[PDB]
Amino acid sequence: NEDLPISMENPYKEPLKKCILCGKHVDYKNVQLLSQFVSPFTGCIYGRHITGLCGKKQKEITKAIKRAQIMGFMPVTYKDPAYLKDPKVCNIRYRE
């Protein structure tokens, strides 16, 4: 009798995955954070599906990258040699 289905909030929903830098602040002073997303060879900037971000995060990342490259804080043609021991976050494929 009282066992009728009730349309509620629909459970069985886990919290959606957020970005790896959504809870922190992104500035141009941090050279290591903006250089970790740079290929340590051709110096190319990785896209969105490689780093694992969205729209606003990737936009802020590339803005900070361009600002650091123009003002004089990070190379564009390669990666900083002193920041080559950073933990690998992006996915690679070269060199097997």
């Binding site: 790896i20 830098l21 922190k24 002073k29 954070l33 970790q36 920041y83 950073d86 933990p87 976050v89």
Partner: protein, 49 residues
């Protein structure tokens, strides 16, 4: 609350008399806002190595 916070923060500025001590403290200090993240989102400071 905002104006009280601003009044509490304005007490640490640079005046006409505090110049030599300020530049000495600035030259005798090295601030580095560099920190990387991993696959989860940890904070790694190069100063600890």
């Amino acid at each position: 609350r905002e104006v009280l916070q601003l009044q509490e923060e304005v007490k640490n500025f640079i005046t006409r008399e505090n110049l030599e001590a300020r530049v000495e403290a600035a030259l005798d200090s090295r601030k580095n806002y560099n920190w990387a993240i991993t696959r989860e989102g940890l904070v790694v400071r190069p100063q600890r190595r």
